[PDB]
């Protein structure tokens, strides 16, 4: 039959802003003391990081950025590029 | 000829260099190397690969 308590709720939600009833807003991060005062970014990483708990990450346009580096390992290089000049001395 | 090589340091110890190819023939075939600088007749000169 009859619906009652309505009970109109346009007040409470301006109660945590009028700017969020149209935009959902930014996140933002946590500061770390360790990482002295700098400030991170949410959509850029420049620093190289390790492949392993780092997602597979995404670009999407410009941003010289670092990486995850895979496999890094250091041996003894040969003397020459290539063809037949291959002088020492 | 594959490859060439040459040396024109000076050095009295055993010097070991190491040169890499690609191997595009395939199958077991052979390799082979040749000086020439000719041996050494006196034993003022002592230039041994």
């Known amino acids: ?89 | 000829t594959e490859k060439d090589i040459t040396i024109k340091g000076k050095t009295t110890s055993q010097y070991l260099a190491s040169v890499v190819m690609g191997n595009l023939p395939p199958r077991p075939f052979n390799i082979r190397m040749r000086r020439m600088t000719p041996d050494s007749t006196t034993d003022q000169l002592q230039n041994k690969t």
């Not at chain 1, 500061?31 to 997602?55: E, R, W």
């Open chain 1, 1 to 89: 039959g009859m619906t009652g308590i309505l009970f109109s709720l346009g007040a409470s939600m301006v109660l945590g802003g009028v700017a969020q009833m149209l935009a959902p807003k930014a996140r933002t991060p946590r500061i770390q003391t360790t990482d002295n005062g700098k400030q991170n970014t949410y959509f850029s990483s420049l620093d190289n990081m390790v492949a392993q708990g780092n997602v597979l990450p995404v670009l999407y346009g410009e941003m010289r950025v670092g990486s995850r580096v895979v496999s890094q390992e250091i041996s003894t290089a040969d003397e020459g590029d290539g063809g037949q000049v291959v002088v020492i001395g």
